[PDB]
Design a protein around this ligand. Structure first.
Ligand SMILES: CC(C)CCC[C@@H](C)[C@H]1CC[C@H]2[C@@H]3CC=C4C[C@@H](O)CC[C@]4(C)[C@H]3CC[C@]12C
Ligand SMILES: CC(C)CCC[C@@H](C)[C@H]1CC[C@H]2[C@@H]3CC=C4C[C@@H](O)CC[C@]4(C)[C@H]3CC[C@]12C
Ligand SMILES: CC(C)CCC[C@@H](C)[C@H]1CC[C@H]2[C@@H]3CC=C4C[C@@H](O)CC[C@]4(C)[C@H]3CC[C@]12C
Ligand SMILES: CC(C)CCC[C@@H](C)[C@H]1CC[C@H]2[C@@H]3CC=C4C[C@@H](O)CC[C@]4(C)[C@H]3CC[C@]12C
Ligand SMILES: CC(C)CCC[C@@H](C)[C@H]1CC[C@H]2[C@@H]3CC=C4C[C@@H](O)CC[C@]4(C)[C@H]3CC[C@]12C
Ligand SMILES: CCCCCCCCCCCCCCCC(=O)O
Ligand SMILES: CCCCCCCCCCCCCCCC(=O)O
Lengths: 232, 284, 73, 339, 225, 59
């Protein structure tokens, strides 16, 4: 399972650039693909989504009609064609793979991302109480986030995802649907909530858990939190 | 009631409507929902759709015949109901021709059919058949007019309008080509079945082919013969009058084939009989 | 004839009046329905008579045909 | 020849068995349970119809969560069905299209398959690559594979048509233990809830009780007159029901070692493909060859209800762990959920 | 009124339904042939000709026609518990040698392998799952049969037979005896062939008989035949 | 000869081992099954029909 993408660097404003991603080690035709943007100072921002059968192509409101996303299943490559870039797109781009079925773990694997630098409402928002907390090793810490709408759908699933971004490393999925742990995630992470207030608890914290925690929704089209930075 | 031909027409149309609706409805029901989709099933479904449309539009013709030409409806309704009648009848005739072609193609080229003949091809051909049926009845819309005779109204035809051309093209496309194709195809099937290396001494295919071709010819042939004759006759003589009165009997006879088609086509298959009997048994 | 008389009045001055009597006589009913062409043998009245006869004839028929025409035709 | 002697000793032991069973039979289940209230008529409509298959469906199994189920048909594919939202979670192409048994793991990770090919193939549903791949091939058996049932995540008990039943190890792949008691082709296999004992029904008209850890046959049941096609444990674990080709469902006790009662009707003459129990155990559901399903009462020997949805022979029937619904498959390529 | 994940799941189900339809169409275009040979038979040879432990399957295309090859010779079990799996096959090839009339099985001295082959053929023809399924009969080892006729009489296997020890008459009698076991004379057709050393001729006969069976099946489905 | 004697000996040993097992009365087993059925009667959605709201297969 590997996602290697390229097509970054310096881009003049108003130009066009194609981001090319190569997926190896897994079945690419059966996975929905996502493009996620992360500013150097701000949090993750969702950009686009294409499904397995190259249908239900969804875009963010800020990039609708300006970016076109396509894929090639025999060549196993995902391309994002960016036109008329402003100075708000000078941010890292991440390729995320998500498969949707009962009991699945979408947003499981993240790419390394490409730096792209440009030379100089009516959506579910996530509210974060505090941005940086001091934590000591071996202690238990709980981080709480809030949603503007109750995410408990009528089928009994609350759609909340937790991501860990260590400094200098890609984001990793920790908890999906606010209860279930992901593959490779140790058992000390846990999550709880009721529909609006959501709490992630870490018991017996280790030095490898230092990073930024992001909360995302997936009820309707996807918004991240601002991020909680953990310091020693 | 005023005439013997009108009485005969009403008896044939009433018997046709009454027999046609349960048989066509049952065949469409069983094929659409109680059976898996095959190539033959698509043909039977489209044929029964055409036959149901013909049977549902039989009361309009029956009432217009009972009223003795009286037309209280608008001009548009008299440019749209005949178009529907012509479209559904010719669509049924075309579907029959296509079924005969499909059977001949299967017997003639079995290897090609077992690899390049599927449900999609059948649906595509049926859609094209409907398009041909539509295009063919275009003049019936474009040239039908309301003739208002002071006291009353009646719907009919009138550079004058070419009616001879419409009838001749109607005869060449809807009668000469289907009859020749059906006779040639069924004859080929009978000939191939009886003369081979593993030919079986049996006469079921010959009997079914003769019955299907005979019923089609007996039904559709008087309508075309009278239609051409009336145009080649001055409508003042007693001959023109008798031809016009008997033409209604021909219309009823044409409707009879639409009534007869489910028994002729769908119910001769053992699997279909099985399914239909089981579904009827469940209701009772 | 009927509304055809109406149409008769809608032909007197649908074409310039050469002879009202010739055209009117041509449009008369036909106890001797034997025909048009023939009726000119025992009368420019001839040509006008033939044209008027043709128009009226064609027209009584277009009614006759309309009177018993079925929907399926 | 002392073989004849041996024959005589075996006959004497069988006489001792029938004498002990006759002596121990102080009463019957019918006269004990005639005093309780009847079950009444039970009518189950078709909640959902699963219609993805194109060929005849043979076996089916329910998941632990009672939402995911596995279906096997002659198209050469295993389909993982979602019960509530009628969705297809997975479609697994088989190497051999001649499948006659499928099983869903109690953990939910694996799906067992088998049939005329001699292999209970294990498919991994939780791969990192996202597709379903073959874990390994289990090629020890010679005869056709009749029933796989995951004993555990690493151990799988199985039955085949070579008159033996084997317990396999998933990791090693070797035939950990082989049970050779049967004298006829084994067709049905059922597992107890405590996961220590299991029952195997064969074509020698006998159902045998086997121990997992020790490895020998505990008891034998010779009530049936024909090939036993289906077997299923009672939820208590002290009894099991068998369905054979003589149109008779028979309930056998493990502790009493006898047939309590027989479920038969005069109009029914066809064989029994599959038998299952409800969560309470009051209702015994049994598929039949005459396009039908009979919900018998397990205590009164009466027909609680009839289920007549399918258009072809009902080959597989399962009841969820929470007892919420019953899924029935047949040879018309349709799965129906009834509750 | 459903979630984003629920929608995506429905889309995945639609894609699976597609793949299933495409694979079903791919499976439907192939013609399926079962093989049944009692004891020792020409199975080992016929399979080799077609090419140019459970169930074995070989795929081969002859004259743009894909054949599914099914052999059940490794199944030493009760056949009635799995023969119903072969209801939907197009053809059944019964392979029977002619050199087995003098030869006997190594289980009983009195019975002959020809009577056993007749018994198996009778069981298959009178089976309830094979009423609509056509049977292609293959007769194996013509030359060794001719040698045995020149050496031994045919009366050892048929006491009621009365005729000359000639290959043509004996072969005709054997063919008539096998075709008289078909109780259903109307719904079933038997395609008797005499297998030879040439591989092309046997496959060609299979192709011709299969072609005829496909035509008859389609006409019966239409209701014409 | 040897195979048949071996099989016969194994069959006799098996049948003898099966005969050596202890037994309990039929009445007691019947009462235990009846008690188990009566105890879990309210927890069976197929025996007693559940309301539409509490049924996951409601639509
Ligand atoms: C005017 C109304 C009454 C016409 C009703 C037509 C229908 C209901 C009738 C007419 C033809 C009948 C079928 C004719 C032949 C068979 C084959 C027989 O082995 C089973 C019954 C079955 C399948 C019949 C079922 C009922 C049937 C389809
Ligand atoms: C779909 C088919 C059945 C519709 C048939 C509609 C027929 C039955 C209706 C529509 C127009 C109606 C006519 C309209 C006007 C009149 C004049 C009135 O003073 C007597 C009744 C009479 C003569 C009606 C008789 C019934 C009638 C002919
Ligand atoms: C209006 C009617 C007469 C049109 C009839 C068109 C018929 C005669 C044509 C159109 C399509 C043609 C088929 C197209 C393709 C093939 C495959 C080839 O390997 C064999 C001939 C065969 C099978 C053709 C047979 C003749 C055919 C069926
Ligand atoms: C009263 C008259 C005008 C009604 C006529 C209805 C006709 C135009 C409609 C009704 C059913 C329709 C068909 C329904 C299904 C299919 C299969 C699809 O793959 C191709 C189009 C096709 C073949 C449609 C063609 C148009 C159709 C035949
Ligand atoms: C495409 C072929 C195979 C079938 C259709 C043939 C049609 C298009 C041809 C064949 C016969 C032709 C007709 C022959 C005679 C007349 C009478 C004339 O006063 C008007 C044109 C008209 C009506 C022709 C129109 C075109 C026609 C109908
Ligand atoms: C008077 C003749 C009646 C004939 C009925 C209409 C026949 C139309 C046939 C259309 C053939 C089109 C083939 C397309 C095949 C494809 O799409 O691949
Ligand atoms: C204007 C009409 C065109 C032809 C329409 C009918 C086509 C019928 C095709 C029948 C095919 C018969 C081929 C026989 C070949 C042979 O001699 O074996």
């Amino acid at each position: 399972v590997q996602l290697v993408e390229s097509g970054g660097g310096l881009v003049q404003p108003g130009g066009s650039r194609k981001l090319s991603c190569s997926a190896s080690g897994f079945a690419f035709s059966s996975f929905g693909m996502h493009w996620v943007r992360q500013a150097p100072e701000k949090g993750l921002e969702w950009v686009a989504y294409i499904s397995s059968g190259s249908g239900t192509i969804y875009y963010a409101d800020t990039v609708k009609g300006r970016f076109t996303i396509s894929r090639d299943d025999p060549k196993n490559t995902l391309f994002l064609q960016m036109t008329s870039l402003r100075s708000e797109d000078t941010a890292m781009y991440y390729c995320v793979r998500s498969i949707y079925y009962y009991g699945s773990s979408p947003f499981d694997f993240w790419g390394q991302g490409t730096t792209l630098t440009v030379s100089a409402s009516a959506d579910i928002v996530m509210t974060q109480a505090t941005s940086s907390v001091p934590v000591t090793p071996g202690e238990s810490v709980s981080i709480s986030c809030r949603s503007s709408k109750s995410l408990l759908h009528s089928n009994g699933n609350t759609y909340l995802y937790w991501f860990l971004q260590r400094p200098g490393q890609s984001p990793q999925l920790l908890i999906y649907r606010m209860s279930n742990l992901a593959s490779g995630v140790p058992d000390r992470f846990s999550g709880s909530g009721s529909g609006t207030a959501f709490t992630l608890t870490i018991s017996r914290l280790e030095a490898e858990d230092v990073g930024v925690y992001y909360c995302m929704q997936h009820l309707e089209y996807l918004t991240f939190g601002a991020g909680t930075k953990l310091e020693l | 009631w005023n005439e013997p031909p009108v009485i005969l027409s009403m008896v044939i149309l009433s018997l046709t409507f009454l027999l046609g609706l349960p048989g066509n409805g049952l065949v469409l029901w069983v094929a659409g929902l109680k059976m898996q989709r095959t190539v033959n099933t698509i043909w039977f479904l489209h044929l029964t759709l055409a036959d149901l449309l013909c049977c549902l539009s039989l009361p309009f013709s029956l009432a217009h015949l009972a009223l003795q030409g009286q037309w209280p409806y608008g001009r548009f309704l008299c440019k749209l109901i005949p178009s529907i009648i012509v479209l559904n009848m010719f669509a049924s005739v075309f579907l029959l021709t296509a079924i005969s072609l499909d059977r001949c193609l299967v017997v003639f080229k079995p290897i090609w059919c077992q690899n390049h003949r599927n449900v999609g091809m059948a649906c595509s051909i049926c859609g094209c058949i409907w398009v041909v049926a539509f295009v063919m009845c275009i003049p019936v819309f474009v040239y039908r007019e309301i003739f208002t005779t002071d006291n009353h109204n009646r719907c009919g035809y009138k550079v004058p309008t070419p009616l001879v051309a419409i009838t001749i093209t109607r005869l060449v496309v809807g009668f000469l080509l289907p009859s020749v194709i059906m006779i040639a195809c069924y004859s080929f099937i009978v000939f191939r079945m009886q003369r081979g290396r593993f030919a079986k001494s049996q006469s079921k295919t010959f009997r079914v082919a003769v019955v299907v071709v005979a019923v089609f010819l007996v039904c559709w042939t008087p309508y075309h013969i009278f239609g051409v004759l009336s145009l080649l006759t001055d409508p003042e003589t007693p001959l023109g009058k008798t031809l016009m009165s008997w033409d209604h009997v021909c219309i009823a006879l044409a409707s009879a084939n639409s009534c007869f088609n489910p028994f002729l086509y769908a119910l001769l298959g053992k699997d279909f009989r099985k399914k239909a009997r089981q579904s009827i048994q469940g209701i009772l | 004839s009927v509304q055809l008389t109406e149409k008769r009045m809608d032909k007197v001055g649908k074409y310039p009046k050469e002879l009202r009597k010739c055209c009117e006589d041509g449009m008369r009913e036909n106890p001797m329905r034997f025909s048009c062409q023939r009726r000119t043998r025992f009368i420019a009245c001839k040509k006008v008579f033939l044209d008027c006869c043709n128009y009226i004839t064609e027209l009584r028929r277009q009614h006759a045909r309309a009177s018993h025409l079925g929907l399926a035709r | 020849s002392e073989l004849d002697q041996l024959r005589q000793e075996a006959e004497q032991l069988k006489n001792q068995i029938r004498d002990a069973r006759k002596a121990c039979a102080d009463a019957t289940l019918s006269q004990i349970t005639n005093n309780i209230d009847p079950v009444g008529r039970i009518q189950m409509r078709t909640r959902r119809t699963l219609r993805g298959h194109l060929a005849k469906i043979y076996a089916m199994h329910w998941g632990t969560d009672s939402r995911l189920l596995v279906s096997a048909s002659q198209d050469g594919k295993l389909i993982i069905w979602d019960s509530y939202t009628t969705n297809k979670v997975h479609a697994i192409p088989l190497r051999s299209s001649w499948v006659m048994t499928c099983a869903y793991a109690p953990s939910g990770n694996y799906v067992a398959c088998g049939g005329l090919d001699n292999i209970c193939s294990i498919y991994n549903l939780k791969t990192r690559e996202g597709n379903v791949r073959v874990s390994r091939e289990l090629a020890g058996h010679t005869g056709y594979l009749s029933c796989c049932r995951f004993l555990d995540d690493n151990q799988i008990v199985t039955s085949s048509g070579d008159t033996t039943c084997a317990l396999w190890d998933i990791e090693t792949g070797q035939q950990t233990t082989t049970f050779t008691g049967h004298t006829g082709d084994v067709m049905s296999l059922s597992l107890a809830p405590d996961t220590r004992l299991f029952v195997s029904g064969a074509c020698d008209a006998s159902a045998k009780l086997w121990d997992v850890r020790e490895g020998m046959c505990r008891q034998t049941f010779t009530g049936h007159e024909s090939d036993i096609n289906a077997i299923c444990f009672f939820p208590n674990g002290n009894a099991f029901a068998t369905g054979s080709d003589d149109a008779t469902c028979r309930l056998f006790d493990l502790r009493a070692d006898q047939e309590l009662m027989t479920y038969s009707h005069d109009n029914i003459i066809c064989g029994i493909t599959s038998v299952s129990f409800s969560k309470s155990g009051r209702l015994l559901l049994a598929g039949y060859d005459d396009f039908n399903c009979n919900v018998w009462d397990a205590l009164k020997a009466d027909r609680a209800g009839v289920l007549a949805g399918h258009d072809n022979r009902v080959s597989c029937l399962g009841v969820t762990d929470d007892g919420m619904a019953v899924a029935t498959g047949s040879w018309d390529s349709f799965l129906k959920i009834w509750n | 009124t459903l979630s984003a994940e629920d929608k995506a799941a429905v889309e995945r189900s639609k894609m699976i339904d597609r793949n299933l339809r495409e694979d079903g169409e791919k499976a439907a275009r192939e013609v399926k042939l079962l093989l049944l040979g009692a004891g020792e038979s020409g199975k080992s040879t016929i399979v080799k000709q077609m090419k140019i432990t459970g169930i074995v399957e070989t795929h081969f295309t002859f004259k743009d026609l894909h054949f599914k090859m099914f052999d059940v010779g490794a199944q030493r079990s009760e056949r009635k518990k799995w023969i119903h799996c072969f209801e939907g096959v197009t053809a059944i090839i019964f392979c029977v040698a002619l050199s087995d009339y003098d030869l006997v099985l190594a289980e009983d001295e009195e019975m002959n392998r020809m009577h056993e082959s007749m018994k198996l053929f009778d069981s298959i023809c009178n089976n309830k799952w094979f009423t609509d399924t056509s049977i292609i009969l293959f007769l194996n080892k013509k030359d060794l049969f001719e040698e045995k006729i020149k050496k031994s009489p045919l009366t050892i296997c048929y006491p009621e037979y009365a005729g000359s020890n000639t290959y043509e008459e004996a072969a005709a009698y054997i063919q008539c005896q096998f075709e008289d076991l078909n109780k259903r004379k109307d719904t079933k057709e038997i395609y008797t062939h005499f297998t030879c050393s040439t591989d092309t001729k046997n496959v060609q006969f299979v192709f011709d008989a299969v072609t005829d069976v496909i035509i008859k099946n389609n006409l019966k489905d239409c209701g014409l035949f | 000869n040897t195979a048949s004697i071996a099989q016969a000996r194994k069959l006799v040993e098996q049948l003898k081992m099966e005969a050596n097992i202890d037994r309990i009365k039929v009445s007691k087993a019947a009462a235990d099954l009846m008690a188990y059925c009566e105890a879990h009667a309210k927890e069976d959605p197929l025996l007693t029909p559940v309301p539409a709201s509490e049924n996951p297969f409601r639509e």
